[PDB]
Amino acid sequence: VALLLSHNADIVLNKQQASFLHLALHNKRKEVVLTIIRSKRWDECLKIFSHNSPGNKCPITEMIEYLPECMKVLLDFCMLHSTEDKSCRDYYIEYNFKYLQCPLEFTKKTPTQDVIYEPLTALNAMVQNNRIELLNHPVCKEYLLMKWLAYGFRAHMMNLGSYCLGLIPMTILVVNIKPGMAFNSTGIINEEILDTTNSYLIKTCMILVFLSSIFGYCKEAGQINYFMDISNVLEWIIYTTGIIFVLPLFVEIPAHLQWQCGAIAVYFYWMNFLLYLQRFENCGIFIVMLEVILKTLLRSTVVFIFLLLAFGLSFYILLNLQDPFSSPLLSIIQTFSMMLGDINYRESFLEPYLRNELAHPVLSFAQLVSFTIFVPIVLMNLLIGLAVGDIAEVQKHASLKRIAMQVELHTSLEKKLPLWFLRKVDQKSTIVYPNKPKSLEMEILKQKYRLKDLTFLLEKQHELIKLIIQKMEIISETE
């Protein structure tokens, strides 16, 4: 290949629109690909491919899919150094994002009749093939950081601000008025006396909550699969209760209803804030873990809610004269509370027994032992083991999942921004001053390929030897 390139050989496609680079990639010929890369004419070799072909795509995507160790060299070619002296301050590193851009750029014609390329093509190709060693290369890291500081940080701080604009005045209202009291824009109704100090803050916060609820209703009606999501339910509850909490801005309302809606609003607000936090990378793996553990716990209540029924309905009969067990529902809630080890042995079992107030002493003490064995020991250890397994499974894929979240974030953001804006904020390179403020499988695969080549050569040799025997001269050693 090097000899044929040194002479001016043409670079064309065939009947399958495959160039020689596609054939070298599909057969995992590493050395010829490295030769094509290290040489001149690499630019035209890269440009020669053609769209519209579902089998022979852009050379970069194919190189990511088949020979990632060559893509690593291709990326190493994109880091330039200045003085090559780590101590110097004018020593800067320049990163070039030449091969991560859209394939529709390489071709000069670019018809794009039916060709639609998704944003961040190279990074998505790396994610869909688990090329974690490539996603950690400094060029890709700087590419993602550039995208972030270019528009992602801003597009998400706007969302956080739009939510906090209703989240913060709610909390300010709660911790500044005594629960149970009625209040309107004029002040606090002390039943009638009217406390009027701090009325300005109260009015401002009541207006900011109202506007946020209205805009949330409008946005959600604009989005209206919908009822299936959980965020939709949470936000519907938040807006419906927050609009009632501050309703005395227009029409009177009983204080009881007002504060019983405030108690739900102020809880679901801060519970929904975690779904906003799950975007950022330093603190979004904990939300994944929390969700996994919560799902695993909820899938087992369909089973381990009959243990509670058994024990609660038996304790309702055995200990019926005591207040905690004086009703079926109260007796089931007390048994749920005893699940962590708070059994009240001395208050519910020993002291009534020494007063001759247990109707069934032997059964009551046998139920205590069987409950202690079954629920605070066996069931809790089962849950702990399940959680340990789930967290290990999540940690096994932490880095790839963390990077894929960011890639998907920016990919989704690209499909909604206007074209001219992306043109304006996009960059082609970056400059950095440092001073200023799975292996064993690959090995055995390679040696399998080597063994197959060995077999092929040995068979050719065998044929040659048989030819020798059938052509030679035999005179003195004839039979």
Ligand X SMILES: CCCCCCCCCCCCCCCCCC(=O)OC[C@H](COP(=O)([O-])OCC[N+](C)(C)C)OC(=O)CCCCCCCCCCCCCCCCC
Ligand Y SMILES: *[C@@H]1O[C@H](CO)[C@@H](O[C@@H]2O[C@H](CO)[C@@H](O)[C@H](O)[C@H]2NC(C)=O)[C@H](O)[C@H]1NC(C)=O
Ligand Z SMILES: O=P(O)(O)O[C@H]1[C@@H](OP(=O)(O)O)[C@@H](OP(=O)(O)O)[C@@H](OP(=O)(O)O)[C@@H](OP(=O)(O)O)[C@H]1OP(=O)(O)O
Binding-site members are: 58, 78, 102, 147, 220, 223, 232, 235, 446-452
- Closer residue to ligand Y in complex, CB, 181/234: 181
Cβ atoms of 272 and 234 within 8 Å: the answer is yes
> Which of 201, 310, 431, 432 is in the footprint of its own copies by CB under 8 A?
310
User: How many other CB atoms sit within 10 Å of the CB of residue 80?
Assistant: 12
- Closer residue to ligand NAG in complex, CB, 269/325: 325
By a kind-dependent CB cut-off of 5 to 8 A, residue 421 interacts, out of ligand Z, its own copies, ligand X, none, with: none
By a kind-dependent CB cut-off of 5 to 8 A, residue 185 interacts, out of ligand Y, ligand X, Ca ion, none, with: ligand Y
Q: Is 304 in the site for ligand 0IG (CB under 6 A)?
A: no
Q: Which long-range contacts (CB under 8 A, 24 or more apart) does 273-282 make?
A: 273/163, 273/167, 275/231, 275/234, 276/159, 276/160, 276/163, 279/156, 279/405, 279/409, 281/402, 281/405, 281/406
Alpha-carbon torsion (337, 290, 415, 163), positive or negative = positive
CB of 284 to its own copies, least distance (A): 9
> Which of 44, 114, 192, 323 is in the footprint of ligand Y by CB under 6 A?
192
H runs (alpha helix) in 180-254: 199-223, 230-245
| Helix/strand/coil for 225 | coil
Distance CA 419, CA 47 (A): 24
> What tokens were used for 37?
């890369």
Q: Which residues define the annotated binding site for (E)-cinnamaldehyde?
A: 58, 78, 102, 147
Only one residue has tokens 């690593």, namely 72
By a kind-dependent CB cut-off of 5 to 8 A, residue 30 interacts, out of its own copies, ligand 0IG, ligand Z, none, with: ligand Z
- Closer residue to ligand Y in complex, CB, 254/437: 254
Q: Which amino acid is at 372?
A: T
Cβ atoms of 185 and 252 within 8 Å: the answer is no
Site string for Ca ion, 218-237 (x = CB under 5 A): --------------x-----
- Closer residue to ligand Z in complex, CB, 69/393: 69
Site string for ligand NAG, 163-202 (x = CB under 6 A): ---------------------------xx-x---------
**Residue 118 phi, psi dihedral angles, 5° rounding:** -70, 155
Name which of residues 443 to 472 contact ligand Z (CB under 6 A).
446
> Which of 190, 370, 412, 435 is in the footprint of ligand X by CB under 6 A?
370
Residues that bind Ca ion (CB under 5 A): 232
Residues that bind ligand Y (CB under 6 A): 184-186, 189, 192, 194
